[PDB]
Amino acid sequence: MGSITENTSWNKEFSAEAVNGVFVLCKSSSKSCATNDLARASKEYLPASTFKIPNAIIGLETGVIKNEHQVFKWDGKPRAMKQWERDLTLRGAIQVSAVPVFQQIAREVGEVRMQKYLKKFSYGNQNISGGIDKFWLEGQLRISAVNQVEFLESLYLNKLSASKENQLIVKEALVTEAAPEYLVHSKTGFSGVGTESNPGVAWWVGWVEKETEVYFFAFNMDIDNESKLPLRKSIPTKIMESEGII
Amino acid sequence: MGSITENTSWNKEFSAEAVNGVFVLCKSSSKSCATNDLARASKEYLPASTFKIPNAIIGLETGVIKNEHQVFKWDGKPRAMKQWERDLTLRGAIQVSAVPVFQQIAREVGEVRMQKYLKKFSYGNQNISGGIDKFWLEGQLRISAVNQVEFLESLYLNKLSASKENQLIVKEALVTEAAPEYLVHSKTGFSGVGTESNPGVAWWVGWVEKETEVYFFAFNMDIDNESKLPLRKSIPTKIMESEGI
Numbered sequence: 416m417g418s419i420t421e422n423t424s425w426n427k428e429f430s431a432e433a434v435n436g437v438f439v440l441c442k443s444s445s446k447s448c449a450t451n452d453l454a455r456a457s458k459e460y461l462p463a464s465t466f467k468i469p470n471a472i473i474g475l476e477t478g479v480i481k482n483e484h485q486v487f488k489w490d491g492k493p494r495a496m497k498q499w500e501r502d503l504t505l506r507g508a509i510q511v512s513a514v515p516v517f518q519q520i521a522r523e524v525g526e527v528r529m530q531k532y533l534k535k536f537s538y539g540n541q542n543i544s545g546g547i548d549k550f551w552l553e554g555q556l557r558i559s560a561v562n563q564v565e566f567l568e569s570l571y572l573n574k575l576s577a578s579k580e581n582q583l584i585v586k587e588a589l590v591t592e593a594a595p596e597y598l599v600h601s602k603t604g605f606s607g608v609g610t611e612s613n614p615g616v617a618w619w620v621g622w623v624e625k626e627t628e629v630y631f632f633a634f635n636m637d638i639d640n641e642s643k644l645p646l647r648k649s650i651p652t653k654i655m656e657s658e659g660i661i
Numbered sequence: 662m663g664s665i666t667e668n669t670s671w672n673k674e675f676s677a678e679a680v681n682g683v684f685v686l687c688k689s690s691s692k693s694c695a696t697n698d699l700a701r702a703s704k705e706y707l708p709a710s711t712f713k714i715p716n717a718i719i720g721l722e723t724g725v726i727k728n729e730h731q732v733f734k735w736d737g738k739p740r741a742m743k744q745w746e747r748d749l750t751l752r753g754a755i756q757v758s759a760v761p762v763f764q765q766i767a768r769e770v771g772e773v774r775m776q777k778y779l780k781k782f783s784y785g786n787q788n789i790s791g792g793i794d795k796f797w798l799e800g801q802l803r804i805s806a807v808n809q810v811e812f813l814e815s816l817y818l819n820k821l822s823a824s825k826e827n828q829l830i831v832k833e834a835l836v837t838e839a840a841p842e843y844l845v846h847s848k849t850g851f852s853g854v855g856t857e858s859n860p861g862v863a864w865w866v867g868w869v870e871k872e873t874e875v876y877f878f879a880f881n882m883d884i885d886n887e888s889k890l891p892l893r894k895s896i897p898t899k900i901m902e903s904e905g906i
Binding site for chain 1: 729730732747748749750752753756757818825826829830832833836837838839840841842844870872873
């Protein structure tokens with residue numbers, strides 16, 4: 416990555432909520448990044464559902480996901496969340512974080528192909544052991560906020576080791592906010608409430624295209640209570656809108 | 662164009678506003694469309710800004726538009742609108758409908774290549790005479806609502822005679838509404854108030870991806886009073902809502 420500068424004043428938003436976390440924000444027009452905590456910016460955590468971004472690209476690249484219009488049919492069996500009990504498009508599955516859809520995609524991709532692509536993507540520690548359908552949820556895979564922004568910037572520029580076509584498909588699927596001159600691509604993540612002395616992690620990563628400017632961001636925080644989930648978006652949002660990226 | 666059925670009940674919104682226009686809605690699931698007026702559905706009108714869709718694709722295909730990240734720098738010379746007086750990305754130019762930006766692109770594309778692609782796209786009457794950079798604004802180019810829908814369906818499916826990459830680039834630049842299971846791609850159009858007994862035309866075309874269903878739409882109406890523009894969105898919205906979309 417380029418240069419990164421620690422800005423301890425950003426901790427203001429974290430203190431107010433008594434949250435232990437990190438936010439990394441990079442402005443493309445300068446190749447510079449800022450963060451409230453340099454140490455945690457480089458610390459690696461379970462990616463949780465933010466892993467659906469590389470998983471989607473790999474699914475497309477390997478042909479497991481036939482094309483952008485593939486519909487993932489619900490077999491009718493009970494699923495962990497009601498929002499997943501329905502047929503979903505690739506964008507739909509990603510947007511509602513439909514774990515079972517991507518677990519099946521991961522099984523079809525397989526260990527060998529999955530490993531190959533995470534190496535090509537320089538994705539975290541590239542550790543997929545423990546079970547092909549859950550390594551990003553409870554396995555040994557880990558990735559840092561800094562590595563997330565590097566990865567997302569590559570995707571934005573279509574520089575990942577995959578077809579431009581597939582990177583573009585996954586990119587539209589990640590759009591979460593659209594205005595004439597304000598476009599946001601993002602993905603949430605939540606590993607769970609963790610265990611005693613081992614909190615879970617919550618994520619919010621993506622990028623913002625405001626006019627001719629582009630900002631890449633990655634946020635993660637320790638979490639042991641679902642009631643704190645909204646903070647994964649509110650803290651980053653307050654930090655960015657305090658930076659003029661309203 | 663699969664099958665199309667006229668549904669006069671849709672005229673309600675039109676009559677309720679004393680507006681002459683047409684709306685074509687197609688449900689991909691069941692290759693069928695509906696319209697309030699079959700005859701007008703096939704009538705061709707000046708595309709106005711909706712033409713920025715085919716133009717953007719052509720600009721990318723021919724190279725005039727370097728890539729998806731190309732920036733369109735403003736030279737400083739005043740423009741018809743303040744919103745266009747600034748640098749713009751490809752999506753920004755489309756979203757705010759920066760006429761000057763695309764006029765320049767058209768010039769670079771060249772009437773020869775422009776004519777070539779409109780033939781590949783089967784875009785309306787394909788008449789770009791009058792002025793290489795104003796034919797869609799006041800030239801003789803004409804296209805129907807049915808033609809807009811089939812053109813947009815081709816784009817959605819990456820079936821236009823262009824690279825899938827360029828089609829995908831233009832598709833994201835057209836996103837106007839984004840939600841978890843609701844995504845809208847769309848483009849507005851307006852030729853002006855026009856002249857007496859010869860009003861202008863207002864457009865609104867695009868498609869809606871709701872859950873796993875996909876709806877393609879095209880709307881146009883005659884307009885002589887700039888105060889009626891909002892109707893290009895309100896009328897279709899009301900009709901689609903009355904359908905469940």
